Amino acid sequence: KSDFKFSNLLGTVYRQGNITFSDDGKQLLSPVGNRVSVFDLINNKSFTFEYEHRKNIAAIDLNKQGTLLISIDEDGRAILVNFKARNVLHHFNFKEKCSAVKFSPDGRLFALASGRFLQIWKTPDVNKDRQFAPFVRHRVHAGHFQDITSLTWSQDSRFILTTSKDLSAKIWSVDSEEKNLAATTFNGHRDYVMGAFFSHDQEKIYTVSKDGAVFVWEFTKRKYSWRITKKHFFYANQAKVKCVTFHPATRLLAVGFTSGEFRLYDLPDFTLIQQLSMGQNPVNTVSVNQTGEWLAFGSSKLGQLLVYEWQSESYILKQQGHFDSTNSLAYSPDGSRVVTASEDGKIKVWDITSGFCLATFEEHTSSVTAVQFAKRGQVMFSSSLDGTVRAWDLIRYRNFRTFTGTERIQFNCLAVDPSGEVVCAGSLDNFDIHVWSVQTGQLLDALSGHEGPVSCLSFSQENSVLASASWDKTIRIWSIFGRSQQVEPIEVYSDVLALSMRPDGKEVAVSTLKGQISIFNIEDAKQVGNIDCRKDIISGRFNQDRFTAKNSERSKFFTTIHYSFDGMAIVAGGNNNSICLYDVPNEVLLKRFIVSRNMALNGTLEFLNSKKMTEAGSLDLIDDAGENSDLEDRIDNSLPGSQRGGDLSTRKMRPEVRVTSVQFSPTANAFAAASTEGLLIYSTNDTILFDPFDLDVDVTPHSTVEALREKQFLNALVMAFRLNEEYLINKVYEAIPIKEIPLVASNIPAIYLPRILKFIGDFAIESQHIEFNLIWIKALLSASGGYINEHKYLFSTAMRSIQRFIVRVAKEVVNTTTDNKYTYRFLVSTDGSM
Amino acid sequence: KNSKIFSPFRIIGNVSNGVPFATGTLGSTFYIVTCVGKTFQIYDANTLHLLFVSEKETPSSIVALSAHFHYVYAAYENKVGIYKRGIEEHLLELETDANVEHLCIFGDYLCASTDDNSIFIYKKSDPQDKYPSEFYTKLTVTEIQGGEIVSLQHLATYLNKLTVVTKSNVLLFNVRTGKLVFTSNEFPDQITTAEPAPVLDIIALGTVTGEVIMFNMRKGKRIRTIKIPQSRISSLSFRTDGSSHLSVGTSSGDLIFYDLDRRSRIHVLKNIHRESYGGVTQATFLNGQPIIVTSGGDNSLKEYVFDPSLSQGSGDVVVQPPRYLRSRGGHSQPPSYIAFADSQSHFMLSASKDRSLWSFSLRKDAQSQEMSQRLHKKQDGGRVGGSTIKSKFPEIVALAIENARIGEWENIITAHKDEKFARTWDMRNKRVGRWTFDTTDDGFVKSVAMSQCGNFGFIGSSNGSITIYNMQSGILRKKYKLHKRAVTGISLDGMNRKMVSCGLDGIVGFYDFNKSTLLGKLKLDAPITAMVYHRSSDLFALALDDLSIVVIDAVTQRVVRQLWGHSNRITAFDFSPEGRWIVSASLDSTIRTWDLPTGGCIDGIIVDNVATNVKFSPNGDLLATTHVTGNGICIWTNRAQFKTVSTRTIDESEFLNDIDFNTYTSLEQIDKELLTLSIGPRSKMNTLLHLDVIRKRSKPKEAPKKSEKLPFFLQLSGEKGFESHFTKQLREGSQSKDYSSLLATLINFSPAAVDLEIRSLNSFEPFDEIVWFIDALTQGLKSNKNFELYETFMSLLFKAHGDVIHANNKNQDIASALQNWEDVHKKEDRLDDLVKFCMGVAAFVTTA
Amino acid sequence: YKLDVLSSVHFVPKPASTSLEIRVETPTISMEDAQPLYMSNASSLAPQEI
Amino acid sequence: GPYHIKYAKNGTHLLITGRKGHVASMDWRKGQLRAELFLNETCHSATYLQNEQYFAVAQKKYTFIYDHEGTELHRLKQHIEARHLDFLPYHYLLVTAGETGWLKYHDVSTGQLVSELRTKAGPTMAMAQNPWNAVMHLGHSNGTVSLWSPSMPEPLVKLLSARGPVNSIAIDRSGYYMATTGADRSMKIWDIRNFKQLHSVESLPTPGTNVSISDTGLLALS
RNA sequence: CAUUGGUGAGCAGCGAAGGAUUUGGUGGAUUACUAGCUAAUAGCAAUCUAUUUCAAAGAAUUCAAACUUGGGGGAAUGCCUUGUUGA
């Protein structure tokens, strides 16, 4: 029922730090602020880790063998993760701002550039168990003079050479007996050094500086040691080198400037292989894959990632996430995609299973406030603050309609008719509901009556009435069809600010500014019951709050509500750090989730640190800006007191935590929450939980396998359902033969009908037995059709996943087969040539 | 006695154990090595944060400790280990069987005195090396020269001299030659301690009466004699701040400070450590600071300061008494009840038989307060009646905690030994709450429970009654009289729907809670001594008295499992965080891990010491147990969380791998008649079908800039025959009329490779390559796997060479190949039949 | 732009406008993003638009 | 943050500045606090300009001029991005050298920007006034020290001191000897009349961060 | 008659060698614990100096440089740019 866990973080591709490839080159590890997303680019499957830091990540490094993953945030706090387990092995504090991590190419020991010191530690084995203190130190070198900005291992693992704001590079040997072989330093640059790299036979060293110069060092004569033989320069005027990388087997130098450019040189001899433009912001990180074919570029301003194959100039991927600008959410009527409406004036259709954006629409000028689909997943509607509401056709990608008012108010919420003929939008500038027809572009009516702005709209589908709820402290139900045109108001205790309607259409759930979810019947306007939701809310102290979180009431209500598709639970979320999952017939909460434990937002903690508070003021409300070494990162583009408009630079405050929208998924037991760090997607594993159903002393996996070996398929399937073990259901499901499928599917019990429907849907969207799954679906729908058509709400989010399977992965095989058949008929039937 | 799931992490909550600690100076900073059973721990001194702990437990207990700059010499049973940063950098095994008793390092020599009065002197090998390594000599003290060796000291400015102080006299040994040089006049008392004074030649000697002898060594004459009466002197320290003070810590709990110039006693700190646990076992002034670190045997280490004087001219006469400064501590007695206090596995509650409730920390060992038993001022108006001699509560025998309403009212309910009521506690303030909860039938609180929402507390007494108190206002609501023996377990569902109780009349009673009815009354055989409720699966477990664990589903209301196999009483047990295992520790010194689905014991540990509490983490990662002796909490981890664990039966031996590791790899193809798809991503077919337009959208907007000089063969210059392999394999497959290897390589090929080879087939001559390719695809469609891939390969062939075979239509070979193709494709239209039916009926069912 | 951001994007919208933009027949695969997947295959114009 | 010391010219007041916002003007000898300001913008330096009574601190962008009590008197719209302040005390001139590669002399009695001079060489890495001569020796990132004057819009004389950036310079009271340390771990003792370097310590076993010379010819290096 | 207004005088009740309110200071926590210093593959920590030096390496935009300005008018004299005379 309600065992959710943090599955995915969707809609954020890269924010800040270090972008890594897998050793095979198939997976791409990128840091969102705390967590780390991993994209498997071949199988098209992403995930993100459940653990998270307390501050933004500054470093990532994965082992060669793909076993261990060290992620270091800002200010030292490393976490060592077991990778193929997805589980945190150890926490270790390095107390200075760590600039770089890198394992050795052997794998045995890792280096760490932290301060002006080079630290070398030994890795813990993964085949062993957890220790109190697994990190055993190797050495700490302290030759440099200022902060160390880069770190590179030799190909054999016996040399490291580092790079620092000393304007200098330095070779250390790992072994004390090879100190004398390599104990040296390299001077001569002018601004910094930003990279130092070995050749593929380590007899040449290339060192690149922030000034824009590459020195080729070689161990030659004029007994003789380490001259500069060549000084090549990039002749960029305003651009500065921001990130360098080097693949030594193919001799590739990939440089990324602060103008947007990246250049690829060959470098024993400095030939411009390519010069391209990632964007119009700085380029903040470069990486290569092990073969040397893919180059991963990342920028932090606007937060984008670009994986580029450079032999044929081809973008493998070009994605751009979002941070603190996501005003609304919707699912496709499937578990396929999520459509987000974001403050930049953009709408993005994101996939789920491979967390990338499939499409972007960019026609609204200002921020897009809300987005809905029709009662079909081909057309969506969006409502924005430029005073317009537009329709979009997701087959030929065009806004075919743009409805506007007359007196140009700016629209906040919208709602679209099930029978897709009517779109009604409500604003806060006018508090009348404006309703347009969809086919003809005209506006039908302005439903008036609300005193004070309209906060939420919704269309009750299975009877088609309109529920509009407003700061009037009033719900109002309009019946706008059938020649009557009649209203009925309901009065609530506070000004309502969220609304949802049951799948039946029989009840409305409202969410008020007093901290109450109320639930009303809609035939008779009487109140059915309310959930009081004010004490199960985690509110936070801001860094600039002069009052306690206990007394603060900016965040003790919910501003988004969604009924489940059963109709039994509500998800709820507002301007606070907790998302709540409630149970309507029992008016008691099932669970509470804590959306972000990142101290670099604001409303996260309840109790700040009095060591940070001085008698001057908080140590965290001091301008750390003008200490910076960059004119562009030092200036302040802000406006006094503005919020919620424009870029994250235009407000001089720490971006708060909030959840802007929530929905339940239509097909699987998941829910998505559009929040300040992205789209948090929570989902359940019937694989991992043990939740049986009508057990007994005899029901056992051994007894079930005994029943299969004694050929009692109905009994084996029913025992596997009562054990509710996923591998057991899968074993017996593939173990029964073809000729007994209709008998078994007839004599299956009505209590285990929805369980077998859920199992077939999930297995079929990821399985290769299309014939077996279709035979099973045909037998079940044949045997038990009237039961499902009767219990249309118990089987909604199971038959929806089954429809998804049929349309997504069976109709495509049918398409290919029919095309081949008709092309063969034309090739073999028609006259030839000459 | 090893395990297969759990593995010991560390034992949490100990500070000291009565072995005299040692102080080690680093640069200008100090650390403190304290002994805790077999491991030691290295504490900072400016803050008392736990820096280091020993990484491997010793084979026996640690007798002595000493600490040079970076190195720590720990003398356990027969050996001496030389550790640095917790890791054993050298071992020094002695050549006897008698245990090591004392240990003193100085210079290049390490002097270790085993208990039969023989001192082993070890020497550094090279005078640059860091610890003594080699055997050098074996001195001995016979009976005619001295009694049992009390201590081994070294005085400053003594070339190769080792001051061995015995129970009768003080000896000096030359350690290089190995020759005694001096024997003091025999003291008429028994000497217990020695301590080198920070002046030359002077050692202080504490006896078993009240005497501290200031004894010279250049002359051999008792310079001073300071009498503590009616005490045994246990630890001596001097001051090196610039004031001439002395600290005499007694074996009664007292610590007395003398000024040696005025011959005065400045002060006496009374009862700092318990007399019953040794008293003061070590006191040390830090070197040049007015800070004394005193450690006892009651699992506590303190340190005090001497604030400077309040006068101006007088100064050393008006000395302020020593005030308190930092300290760490734990439990003195073993712990009684533990509980995980949140879902992060950050905090433990631990209530112990010294009547103290602590809040230990599993993240940082300096976050662990003690919860304060300081009552609240009444809300009625009367005066609370107790003793005016303040005391601690009786010991705790049950605890319930619920974090749903934290920081708003109380969320712990504790049941104390032989009292008639429970207490509320508050984990926010770490204080007691303002409500106490009575039973109302003269019965002791035998068990307690809390609602999930944090509103209700259920108290089950020792006469059957269940009282239900609201926790915000701590006010009584209900009372359930089903049992007439005691009530040994209460629980409420997560939906506040049903409520289980279980009691010593062998009775389980399932009540409703939203109504106030009885749903059922189950009677088992034996009495019932414990109940654990897993709410996520609605299964509870009852530990009985015919030595079994009865697992009962609460909804269908009957016994589903009955785990047998314990051979004595069942002390404690708990569920897995997901509902799959029950871990049960029992009084036959065993810990068994039973599996709930298959029903059998999958793991068994034998412990040396009986285990009285066992609690899984609320997260998956930790197991926490606690035993009969030992003042800590043993922490174990999950190999099962980082790996997979087989589920067999082990216990009768020690004391179908699909089903074992409970994973199931799906069949590649069930029948040889049913269709399948490819084993891979479902995007390979769409990419092959639309391989050109996706690359066209991937290419950038503008042209990139290049140079003019470039190597033409740059790819081949990236440094470090006759036929093609695909065509060769197709040719051999045509020769042998077997294309299986060709189809293996075609499924193997990547998107571009496939398009490249299929475009570069040969299509001019009597078309052998096209005929062989279509023959291979017909063999694949007869093989009935990779159906999407063979259909998409034929579509690619028709889009590349459609014009060639269209022009050369009705040629015999291509006609025959296409006829066989059409035969098998006709044979496989049934998939479209299936899809049409399922889509139409599903649409009708869902909408209409 | 500066005024809207300063005023915390509450404002009153633009009056209206019109513009007769053009379109071009392309596959929607090439119309959408740069990524290994896709979601629609048809052209960019209707059959009555061609 | 890390503080920053200035003494008055009488040697009777002390002006400390911390990198965060703490600016304190105190009497140091009778233990008084004349003015304490918790400015929040990162402050770089500060000088008592003519008395104990007025002092100018350099802030995140603009230089500010404060009274003897913390009453802010002026903010200088023309002194953008300064890190080095100074005061020619007979000429009543506040000299500010910044990150903009400019050098500005502002007459503090009238209120008038006497001169704006464009150092070509980019952000200034050190600065010290020759007191006997009242001429500003700046030290650039190239390694050149430059003697500057507010009438000539050209450097009076350029000296190549060190390889790579100059770290700190300091001129003797008598106006004859300049000490300059540069980030190539080097320290030069230069003569200023006739401009002949005297002697050049070449391998300091860390770069020299600060130099100062007393009124007895004592030479202090940090 | 009430006071859901203040100031006092007494009970009933609670009630173990007392009780209540306010308040200065210090300690420990408020993020998840791998020891101090330095010139650092080691040394010091009771000291770095009567080895603290030498050898090596190390010098573009022939100066590209305020990306750093509240709005309008101007700018004698300055400053910048371009040309010119004379050395």
What six digits make up the tokens of A477? 């139900």
Distance CA B595, CA B684 (A): 42
Task: Note whether C15 contacts A408, CB cutoff 8 Å.
Answer: yes
Contact status of D40 with chain A (Cβ, < 8 Å): yes
Contact status of C3 with chain A (Cβ, < 8 Å): no
Residues 13-72 of A with CB under 7 A from strand E: 54-55
Provide the 10 A C-beta neighbour count for residue B31. 18
Distance CA A715, CA A32 (A): 49
Task: Note whether D42 contacts A626, CB cutoff 8 Å.
Answer: yes
Q: Which residues contact A24 (CB under 8 A, 6 or more apart)?
A: A290
Provide the 10 A C-beta neighbour count for residue B41. 21
Q: Are C3 and A287 in contact (CB under 8 A)?
A: no
Q: Is the CB of D105 under 7 A from strand E?
A: no
Residues 373-402 of B with CB under 7 A from strand E: 377, 380-389
Residue D93, Cβ density class (10 Å: 0-12 exposed, 13-18 middle, ≥19 buried): buried
- DSSP letter (8 states) at residue B705: B
Distance CA A30, CA A15 (A): 8
Q: Is the CB of D67 under 7 A from strand E?
A: no
Which residues 307-326 of A are in CB contact (within 8 Å) with C? 315-319
Task: Note whether D42 contacts A617, CB cutoff 8 Å.
Answer: no
**Closest by CA position to B350, among listed B395, B305, B392:** B395
Q: Which residue has the tokens 């005078």?
A: B127
Distance CA D17, CA D58 (A): 10
Nearest CA in chain C to B697: C30
Task: Note whether B698 contacts C37, CB cutoff 8 Å.
Answer: no
Sheet holding B50-53, edge to edge: B22-26, B29-36, B39-44, B50-53
- DSSP letter (8 states) at residue A809: I
**Closest by CA position to A241, among listed A273, A282, A271, A278:** A282
Q: Is the CB of A810 under 7 A from strand E?
A: no
Element (H, E) at B171: strand B170-174
**How many CA within 13 A on the CB side of residue B386?**
9
Distance CA A312, CA A88 (A): 40
Regarding beta strands B431-438 and B421-426, do their DSSP bridges make them parallel or antiparallel, or are they unpaired? Answer: antiparallel
Distance CA D206, CA D222 (A): 10
In C, which residues are within 8 Å of A337 by CB distance? 39
Task: Convert A493-525 into a string of H (helix), E (strand) and C (coil).
Answer: CCCEEEEEECCCCCEEEEEECCCEEEEEECCCC
Q: Which residues contact A405 (CB under 8 A, 6 or more apart)?
A: A387, A411, A430, A434, A443
Sheet holding A27-31, edge to edge: A20-21, A27-31, A36-40, A45-48
Break chain A down into helix, strand, coil percent, rounded to 5: 15, 40, 50
**Which of D22, D41, D164 shows the shortest C-beta gap to A626?**
D41
Residue B308, Cβ density class (10 Å: 0-12 exposed, 13-18 middle, ≥19 buried): exposed
What six digits make up the tokens of B118? 């023989």
Task: Note whether B788 contacts A816, CB cutoff 8 Å.
Answer: yes
Q: Which residues contact B811 (CB under 8 A, 6 or more apart)?
A: B766, B767
For residue A382, list its beta bridge partners. A371, A390
Q: Are B65 and B19 in contact (CB under 8 A)?
A: yes
Q: What is the sign of the dihedral through the CA atoms of A749, A754, A756 and A760?
A: positive
**Closest by CA position to A153, among listed A173, A137, A167, A179:** A173
Taking the CA of residue B474 and the C1' sugar atom of nucleotide E1, their distance in angstroms comes to 39
Distance CA B241, CA A170 (A): 46
CA B214 to chain centre: 49
Contact status of D184 with chain A (Cβ, < 8 Å): yes
Distance CA A51, CA A31 (A): 13
Contact status of D164 with chain A (Cβ, < 8 Å): yes
Element (H, E) at A168: strand A168-173
- DSSP letter (8 states) at residue B39: E
Provide the 10 A C-beta neighbour count for residue A827. 17
Give CA angle at B22 (B19, B27), nearest 5°.
Answer: 165
Cα of A639 to nearest chain C Cα, Å: 6
Length reported for chain C: 50
Q: Are A241 and A212 in contact (CB under 8 A)?
A: yes
Sheet holding B475-481, edge to edge: B445-450, B456-461, B465-470, B475-481
Residue type, B541: A
Please report, for residues A442, A481, A806, D3, D68, the alpha-carbon distance to residue A425 in angstroms, rounded to integers and kept in the order given: 14, 17, 35, 59, 62
How far is it between the farthest Cα atoms of chain A? 104
Contact status of C32 with chain B (Cβ, < 8 Å): yes
Task: Convert D8-53 into a string of H (helix), E (strand) and C (coil).
Answer: CCCCCCEEEECCCCEEEEECCCCCCEEEEEECCCCCCCEEECCCCC
**Closest by CA position to B561, among listed B573, B548, B551:** B551
Q: At what angle do helices A811-829 and B830-847 cross, to 10 degrees?
A: 140
Q: Which residue has the tokens 């506007």?
A: A404
Q: Are B425 and A560 in contact (CB under 8 A)?
A: no
**Closest by CA position to A732, among listed A765, A710, A758, A764:** A710
Nearest CA in chain A to D19: A627
Please report, for residues A582, A661, A779, B701, D152, the alpha-carbon distance to residue A671 in angstroms, rounded to integers and kept in the order given: 13, 11, 31, 38, 72
Regarding beta strands D55-58 and D46-48, do their DSSP bridges make them parallel or antiparallel, or are they unpaired? Answer: antiparallel
Distance CA D222, CA D216 (A): 18
Which residues 16-45 of C are in CB contact (within 8 Å) with A? 16, 23, 28, 31-40, 42-45
Element (H, E) at B500: strand B498-503
Q: Are B51 and B28 in contact (CB under 8 A)?
A: no
Task: Using DSSP, state whether A683 is helix, strand or coil.
Answer: strand
Interface test with C, best of A365, A366, A392 (most C CBs within 10 A): A366
Give CA angle at B366 (B365, B370), nearest 5°.
Answer: 100
For chain C, first and last CA: distance in Å?
40
Q: What is the DSSP string of B395-451?
A: PEEEEEE-TTSBTTB--EEEEETT-SEEEEEETTTTEEEEEEEE-SSS--EEEEEE-
Distance CA A200, CA A206 (A): 11
Q: Which residues contact A512 (CB under 8 A, 6 or more apart)?
A: A473, A492, A493, A494, A495, A496, A497, A518, A557
Q: Are A385 and A374 in contact (CB under 8 A)?
A: no
What six digits make up the tokens of B682? 């479902």
Residue A344, Cβ density class (10 Å: 0-12 exposed, 13-18 middle, ≥19 buried): buried
Give CA angle at D48 (D45, D51), nearest 5°.
Answer: 175
Q: What is the DSSP string of B190-225?
A: -EEEEEE-SSTTEEEEEESSSEEEEEESSS--EEEE
Q: Are B34 and B302 in contact (CB under 8 A)?
A: no
Method: cryo-EM
Sheet holding A474-479, edge to edge: A454-460, A465-470, A474-479, A486-491
Nearest CA in chain A to B555: A694
Taking the CA of residue B323 and the C1' sugar atom of nucleotide E20, their distance in angstroms comes to 29
Q: Is the CB of B366 under 7 A from strand E?
A: yes
Q: At what angle do helices B768-783 and B812-827 cross, to 10 degrees?
A: 20
Those chains having 3 or more beta-carbon pairs within 8 angstroms of chain A are B, C, D
Cα of C30 to nearest chain B Cα, Å: 5
